[PDB]
Paper text:
The HLAI residues that are polymorphic are mainly those forming the peptide-binding groove, which contains six binding pockets (A to F) that define the size and chemical characteristics of the specific peptide repertoire that can be accommodated by each HLAI molecule. Cognate T-cell receptors (TCRs) expressed on CD8+ T-cells detect pathogen-derived peptides presented by HLAI molecules on the surface of infected cells. In this study we focus on two HIV-1-specific epitopes and their presentation by 4 different members of the HLA-B7 superfamily, HLA-B*07:02, HLA-B*42:01, HLA-B*42:02 and HLA-B*81:01. We show that single polymorphisms between different alleles of the HLA-B7 superfamily can induce a conformational switch in peptide conformation that is associated with differential HLAI-specific escape mutation and immune control.
HLA-B*81:01, together with HLA-B*57 and HLA-B*58:01, is one of the group of HLAI molecules most strongly associated with immune control of HIV-1 and the viral replicative capacity in HLA-B*81:01+ subjects has been reported to be lower than in subjects expressing any other allele.
Residue numbers in the entry:
A (entry chain C): 1 to 9
B (entry chain B): 0 to 99
C (entry chain A): 0 to 277
């Protein structure tokens, strides 16, 4: 089950 | 630096037996960047029905892929894997040896 | 022993002049791949790559598909930003890779979590094992680090890694179980290949094993040998299992002084093998 996108680098 | 050349192994799924259907594998690993071309060859000729695995990578971030096809080996047919990558000036051909 | 992992491996590759950067994601439980997504598919969607995950309902596939599409967009922003941090030309191709996931013990409890990145194949920034702080490779990655800290990202990752990562990994192991909790020991043998009148190769084979981790070692007179040995990378058979060999060049007539030693989780005790001229 993947995590969501987060924040860009 | 930021380019790594593929390692290539060519081998069967099962121990080869002349006349018995099997799978021919060409495993390409240790490479970067990810774009790569690979053909499986029967007596020099490209084999059409070839499949490959989904792109993944190792702990050192280098990529790996398995290319494979059904085949039935014989005493006389030669098989090989031909690979091109940005690190190679020309395609590298590695011949299948049933003992490796 | 008895431990398990879940991992997702993301690859974004830019291709100026040939569209937007490709995004690919694969998911694994241990050495078993179970899902994929590829932005270059005609209709990009998360797809099953093992039988046991097919049972999940439409809400699972839909959620995850929407995740990957968002991640693809986020990675495209990251690629732009990284090109800027490195003063790089808009004309070249660059790669952003991402790996995350959790390791659990036999009791299902978190042993450790992971969330790290590479740029053009070099480590860029990583979530530390505390799940609270970051390690940056260079001054570009320090920029990303400040941004991640500002957005509280480690906190979110910690909650995922302690929570859903472990919980879903447990669900897979429990219904997925026949394949995921089953170690298959290697089938082993030694072959003999004359090289000359003076020398022969002994090749020690391990076939049909899972998971991939194995150790194969040749001793001479009970002493570990690396001189005049060759050890191939462990390789996939294509049927979920793996293969590997190690070889040693020996003086002909001295074959019986050589032993091959095999260690694998599927083995109750390590094996030692000699060539048996049948």
């Amino acid at each position: 089950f993947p995590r969501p996108w987060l924040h860009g680098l | 630096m930021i380019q790594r050349t593929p390692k290539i192994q060519v081998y069967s799924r099962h121990p080869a037996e002349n006349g018995k259907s099997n799978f021919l594998n060409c495993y390409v690993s240790g490479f970067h960047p990810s774009d790569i071309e690979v053909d499986l060859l029967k007596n020099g000729e490209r084999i059409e029905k070839v499949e490959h695995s989904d792109l993944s990578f190792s702990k050192d971030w280098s990529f790996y892929l398995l290319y494979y096809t059904e085949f039935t080996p014989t005493e006389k047919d030669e098989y090989a894997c031909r690979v091109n990558h940005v690190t190679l000036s020309q395609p590298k051909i590695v011949k299948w040896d049933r003992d490796m | 022993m008895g431990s398990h992992s879940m991992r997702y491996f993301y690859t974004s590759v830019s291709r100026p002049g040939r569209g937007e950067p490709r995004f690919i994601s694969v998911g694994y439980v241990d050495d078993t791949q179970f899902v994929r997504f590829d932005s270059d598919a005609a209709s990009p969607r998360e797809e099953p790559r093992a039988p046991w995950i097919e049972q999940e309902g439409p809400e699972y596939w839909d959620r995850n598909t929407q995740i990957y599409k968002a991640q693809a967009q986020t990675d495209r922003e990251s690629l732009r930003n990284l090109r800027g941090y490195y003063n790089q030309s808009e004309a070249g191709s660059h790669t952003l890779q991402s790996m995350y996931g959790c390791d659990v013990g036999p009791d299902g409890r978190l042993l450790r979590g992971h969330n790290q990145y590479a740029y053009d194949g070099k480590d860029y920034i990583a979530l530390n094992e505390d799940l609270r702080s970051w390690t940056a490779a260079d001054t570009a990655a320090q920029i990303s680090q400040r941004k991640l800290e500002a957005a509280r990202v480690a906190e979110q990752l910690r909650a995922y890694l302690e929570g859903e990562c472990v919980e879903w990994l447990r669900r897979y192991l429990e219904n997925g179980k026949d394949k995921l909790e089953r170690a298959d020991p290697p089938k082993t043998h030694v072959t003999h290949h004359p090289i000359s009148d003076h020398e022969a190769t002994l090749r020690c084979w391990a076939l049909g094993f899972y998971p991939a981790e194995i150790t194969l070692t040749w001793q001479r007179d009970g002493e570990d040998q690396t001189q005049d040995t060759e050890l191939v990378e462990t390789r996939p058979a294509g049927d979920r299992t793996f293969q590997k060999w190690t070889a040693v060049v020996v003086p002909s007539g001295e074959e019986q002084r050589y032993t091959c030693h095999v260690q694998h989780e599927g083995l109750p005790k390590p094996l030692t093998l000699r060539w048996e001229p049948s």
